[PDB]
């Protein structure tokens, strides 16, 4: 069954005669919803996907230079010029260099000097805008502990369809009213994805290119180092890969995954309202399971203090009510604690069918009691309704 | 001639009858040494090279992972084990994961989990120890303004040979006594070299390998990210290239060059002592240049306020003394200022030979006077001995 093994598991109880139940859905989390005379339901958020995202800005984190050229003038002959100064693909810088008789000038003193290089981007990171209108939440709704699908439903929630109705066979129907970023971008850097704040992403000190789309880079000087060697010559060297520095600057930032055109979100929470009104209990008109039950394995405690029990039923008596409870004294068999797998029913009309049960035992000593009469099975339990009523067989 | 065009140029004056002159030699710098009745000498530090350096430590700045494996145990079954835990090539991490009926365990709760990956270094930076005993300084010594080598000497200074003697032909000999790091390393990262402090280099948060040379890396965890995804699984991803982050962390650090086995230093200074004792003036026994001088181009001011003059001498009269000075009044021709190209002599016995002169003019108005009598050449000069004496020709 669902939720039993989950560490991040929530237990929500709906009021008697109530219609709505408030639920908060986390990634890798389960919510077990219980209600008086209603079946216990499991609600889990499977996936959160953002699709059709528009590119807002690209940043160069690894670059390469080529086609280097230089120009210089004599001390009073004005500023140095290169055709590459007008080319957007070229990164250029103007300085002053020592000129004189020894290097082709009639005068001594500082002369203008320009250096140019063709900038090429080797690797880039992209930032995409998250549209709240293109979000897709995939929720799983299950009847907690129904026999082995009819009793489970996969629903898709979107701003276009924030209201969904799930049919759970003989357990009726369940309604979901949910509320599916205003300052977040979707960052992609070499198959690694992140959710970053608009302000931080805008201030990145790397060569950039805004919008869609050879290309033309702005602030190419961020990955290109222009050095002045003792006022004798100007050198140009590319800085190298910044992905590691960007990674460290992304300390504590939210991660993400890919699906080709859709981006899977690994974090966030979804607030919902559950319409319990149409949920119904299965087997209110059934007879009680008369044959013997046997434990297929020893009962085990979950991470939340509850007890999971697997039983095999020897009977062939169609769909019947499973007698299951906990008692502190074996004489009067007064019910203690409660059943999470509320009002359990066997659906199989064939022998030795299996059933999974979940009980919420009281604190201290108690017994797990499955079945009725002499053929009933017991197991002592130590910690730290939902049970079908029946006549006295003892 | 040397030093005239150099911006970082020093002028040092030696006392009359003096033996030693203290000099500090910088990279891309010139020192013009002047002394009474001695030839003017140019001293320049050409190269500083450190050879035969022993490797002290290698740091991985870009890595790659492969051969990923995992192992897990059930809640009470103890710690997870992999053979890769004992392998030095493998980076491993132990954690706790949710275990239960749904994933192969009889009990629910946290179970031990280990994850391993084969670490491979793609790119590395090396740190080498600078031995003071393996330093080599190459110094250039020139006679400042001698005619067009005999009057120049290339000397090599090492801790093995910190004393050197340079022969300058007819200008005698010159002695050099110099003093050729205790907390510095030679860093190499993808053809780029640096001089870094021992303390900083030792604290680098990257996978390392000490000494010579499967290889075996320590602190592989610095480039490998082990993530825990909602206590359900452990992921392993390599961080990527750190060269950019290392580059930025090397803010203000000294740079360097290569020669295959030798490392060129672009910074530092060399303190020396010059033995002026054996230096002699050329042409004290020569006659005066009787023929006419002509300016080959207009005199030019250097970056240090001095004046450079190029003259052509029409005479065929062998080696003679060049009449050159500055005067404020053309009548008495009393010498003002001084000559940097002290006691100039023509060596060529062939006509129209060329000579370069350097004068230190007084402040304000003065005249450059080359030659004697009616055939002498003049040029007016405005700013902001070393002259051969001769009889009156005026």
């Amino acid at each position: 069954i669902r939720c039993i093994g989950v560490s991040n598991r929530d237990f929500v109880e709906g009021m008697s005669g109530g219609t709505w139940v408030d639920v908060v859905l986390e990634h890798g989390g389960c919510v077990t919803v219980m209600a008086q005379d209603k079946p216990t339901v499991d609600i889990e958020l499977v996936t959160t996907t953002v699709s059709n995202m528009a590119e807002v800005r690209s940043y160069c984190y690894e670059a390469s230079i080529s086609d280097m050229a230089s120009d210089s003038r004599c001390p009073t002959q004005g500023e140095a010029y290169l055709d590459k100064q007008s080319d957007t693909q070229y990164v250029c810088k103007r300085t002053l260099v020592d000129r004189g008789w020894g290097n082709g000038c009639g005068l001594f003193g500082k002369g203008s000097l320009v250096t140019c290089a063709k900038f090429a981007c080797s690797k880039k990171m992209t930032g995409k805008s998250i549209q709240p209108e293109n979000l897709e939440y995939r929720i799983m709704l299950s009847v907690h502990g129904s026999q082995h699908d009819e009793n489970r439903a996969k629903v898709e929630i979107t701003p276009n369809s924030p209201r969904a109705e799930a049919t759970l066979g003989g357990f009726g129907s369940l309604g979901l009213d949910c509320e599916p970023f205003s300052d977040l971008y979707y960052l992609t850097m070499n198959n690694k994805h992140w959710l970053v704040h608009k302000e931080w992403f805008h201030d990145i000190p790397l060569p950039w290119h805004a919008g869609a789309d050879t290309p033309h880079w702005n602030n190419k000087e961020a990955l290109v180092e222009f050095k002045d060697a003792h006022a004798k010559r100007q050198t140009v060297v590319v800085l190298g890969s910044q992905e590691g520095a960007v990674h460290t600057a992304l300390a504590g930032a939210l991660e993400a995954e890919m699906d080709g055109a859709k981006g899977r979100l690994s974090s966030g929470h979804l607030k919902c309202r559950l319409k319990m009104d149409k949920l119904r209990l299965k087997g209110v008109s059934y007879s009680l399971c008369t044959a013997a039950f046997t434990f297929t394995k020893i009962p085990a405690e979950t991470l939340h203090g509850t007890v999971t029990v697997e039983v095999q039923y020897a009977g062939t008596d169609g769909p019947c009510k499973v007698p299951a409870q906990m008692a502190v004294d074996m004489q009067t068999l007064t019910p203690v604690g409660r059943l999470i797998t509320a009002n359990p029913v066997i659906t199989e009309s064939t022998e030795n069918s299996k059933m999974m049960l979940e009980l919420d035992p009281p604190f201290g000593d108690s017994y797990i009691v499955i079945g009725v009469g002499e053929k009933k099975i017991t197991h002592h339990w130590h910690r730290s309704g939902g049970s079908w009523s029946h006549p006295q067989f003892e | 001639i040397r030093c005239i065009g150099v911006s970082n140029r020093d002028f040092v004056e030696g006392m009359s009858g003096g033996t030693w002159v203290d000099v500090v030699l910088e990279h891309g710098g010139c020192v013009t040494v002047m002394a009474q009745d001695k030839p003017t000498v140019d001293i320049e530090l050409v190269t500083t090279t450190v050879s035969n350096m022993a490797e002290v430590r290698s740091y991985c700045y870009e890595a790659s992972i492969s051969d990923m494996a995992s192992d897990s145990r059930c809640p009470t079954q103890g710690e997870a084990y992999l053979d890769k835990q004992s392998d030095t090539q493998y980076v491993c991490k132990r954690t706790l994961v949710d275990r239960g009926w749904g994933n192969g365990c009889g009990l629910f709760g946290k179970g031990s989990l280990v994850t391993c990956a084969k670490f491979a270094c793609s790119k590395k930076m090396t740190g080498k120890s600078i031995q003071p005993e393996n330093l080599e300084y190459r110094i250039m010594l020139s006679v400042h303004g001698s005619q067009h080598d005999e009057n120049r000497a290339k000397v090599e200074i090492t801790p093995n040979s910190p004393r050197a003697e340079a022969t300058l032909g007819g200008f005698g000999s010159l002695g050099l006594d110099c003093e050729p790091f205790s907390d510095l390393y030679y860093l190499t990262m993808n053809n780029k070299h640096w001089l870094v402090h021992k303390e900083w280099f030792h604290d680098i948060p990257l996978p390392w390998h000490a000494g010579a040379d499967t290889p075996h890396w320590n602190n592989k965890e610095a480039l490998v990210e082990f993530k825990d995804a909602h206590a359900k699984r452990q992921t392993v991803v390599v961080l990527g290239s750190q060269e950019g982050a290392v580059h930025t962390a090397l803010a203000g650090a000294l740079e360097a060059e290569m020669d295959g086995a030798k490392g060129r230093l672009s910074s530092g200074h060399l303190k020396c002592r010059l033995k002026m004792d054996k230096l002699r003036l050329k042409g004290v026994s020569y006659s005066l240049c009787t023929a006419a001088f002509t300016f080959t181009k207009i005199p030019a001011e250097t970056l240090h306020g001095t004046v450079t003059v190029e003259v052509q001498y029409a005479g065929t009269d062998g080696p003679c003394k060049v009449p050159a000075q500055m005067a404020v009044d053309m009548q008495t021709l009393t010498p003002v200022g001084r000559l940097i190209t002290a006691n100039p002599v023509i060596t060529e016995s062939t006509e129209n030979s060329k000579m370069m002169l350097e004068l230190d003019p007084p402040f304000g108005d003065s005249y450059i006077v080359i030659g004697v009598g009616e055939k002498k050449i003049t040029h007016h000069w405005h700013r902001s001995g070393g002259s051969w004496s001769h009889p009156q020709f005026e």
Partner: antibody, heavy 121, light 109 residues
Framework: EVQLVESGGGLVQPGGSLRLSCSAS????????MHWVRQAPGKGLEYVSA????????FYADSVKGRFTISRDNSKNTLYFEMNSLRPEDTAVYYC???????????????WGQGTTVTVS | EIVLTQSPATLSLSPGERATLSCRAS??????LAWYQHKPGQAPRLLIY???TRATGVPARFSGSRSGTDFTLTISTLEPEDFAVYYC??????????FGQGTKVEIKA
């Protein structure tokens, strides 16, 4: 003795490619700026290209700009001239010229190669 | 763009005679002018640099002179080996280090 021995010359088609080489000996190659000078039949000498000693900066005349590429390998002591999109106007004897330089492309004294002939028909 | 204009186009002389070759620069280039000798089947040979400095092994009969933007190469007494094409080359500031069109020094009929 200081020498420049060139090769790579030959007969080529219009729009074709060719690569010239110029091997150097008798001097430290990195201390010399290298230049390409050409002479078309019946014409004078033409300065077309230049490269600094370290090979970090290159110059091209408007006549060869875009089509021709100058390069050097200081470990191999060789100068190269990649010629693409060759026109009949490019038919000439090509000379590699070298001169000791301590400032970009400037030189006083020089050394010339024997010359190699490039023909475009 | 610096232009060098050589004159005359052809100089027809006998051995022993004086050859005076001219080169005018389109603008002031100080003394950054070189002279070359070019014989058939041979590469050009540098004769003079810095307008008046004779290169290594260049004989005394070759001399360079200058008056403003006007440059002169004089071959005082022509020897049989001096009949060739002569070029001037400007080396002012930055490339192109342009050449003159050339002067042919030919044997007189």
């Amino acid at each position: 003795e200081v020498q420049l021995v060139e090769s790579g010359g030959g007969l080529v088609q219009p729009g074709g490619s060719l690569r010239l080489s110029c091997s150097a000996s008798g001097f430290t190659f990195s201390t010399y700026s290298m230049h390409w000078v050409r002479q078309a039949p019946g014409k004078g000498l033409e300065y077309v290209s230049a490269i600094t000693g370290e090979g970090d900066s290159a110059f091209y005349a408007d006549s060869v700009k875009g089509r021709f590429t100058i390069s050097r390998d200081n470990s191999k002591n060789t100068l190269y001239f990649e010629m693409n999109s060759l026109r009949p106007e490019d038919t000439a004897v090509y000379y590699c010229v070298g001169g000791y330089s301590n400032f970009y492309y400037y030189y006083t004294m020089d050394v010339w190669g024997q010359g190699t002939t490039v023909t475009v028909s | 763009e610096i232009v060098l204009t050589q004159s005359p186009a052809t100089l027809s002389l006998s051995p022993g005679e004086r050859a005076t070759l001219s080169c005018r620069a389109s603008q002031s280039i100080s003394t950054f002018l070189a002279w070359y000798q070019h014989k058939p089947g041979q590469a050009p040979r540098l004769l003079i640099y810095d307008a008046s400095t004779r290169a290594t092994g260049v004989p005394a009969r070759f001399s360079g002179s200058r008056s403003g933007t006007d440059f002169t190469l004089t071959i005082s007494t022509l020897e049989p080996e001096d009949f060739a094409v002569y070029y001037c080359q400007q080396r002012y500031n930055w490339p192109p280090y342009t050449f003159g069109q050339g002067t042919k020094v030919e044997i007189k009929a």
